[PDB]
Structure 1
């Protein structure tokens, strides 16, 4: 029942890890656009419901550290037939 990223209520497993809805979506966005966030304070921010929204670089480091995998985000499998919809 707990999001391994921020400790919020988990909605299930997203990209192979138990997380909450926002962390799920923020991972998605982060991967699909190969984002490169840079920490303001000291790249070492602890995550909670507040902080998660305050440090993108640290929210992603953790999504990653908690087992959430990028390769599962729009992998090059079929269903890449939506790409064929004009």
Structure 2
């Protein structure tokens, strides 16, 4: 029945649960980078893009909004654990 595990953000093939959501490697990295830079994006369309494999590279605002809506947890990106006091 499950023929392909699906990224909840963009529908590409999911690689695993990242920051608490089933997502692809693209969305994982996009989310991590967005969060570590505290990026604020501005949609140059109508603030309501449907995410897919094409619209994920075209609208960062709507992609990040979707990441969060699907349950990606930004407090889990490089939290203040022993491992970070490392790097």
Number of aligned residue pairs: 83
Residue of structure 1 equivalent to 2:38 = 34
**Structure 1: distance between partners of 2:71 and 2:31:** 12
Structure 1 residue runs of 5 or longer lacking an equivalent are: none
- CA displacement at 1:81 relative to structure 2: 3.3
- CA displacement at 1:80 relative to structure 2: 1.8
The 4+ residue runs of structure 1 with deviation greater than 2 A are: none
TM-score (norm 1): 0.93
RMSD of aligned Cα (Å) = 1.1
Structure 2 residue runs of 5 or longer lacking an equivalent are: none
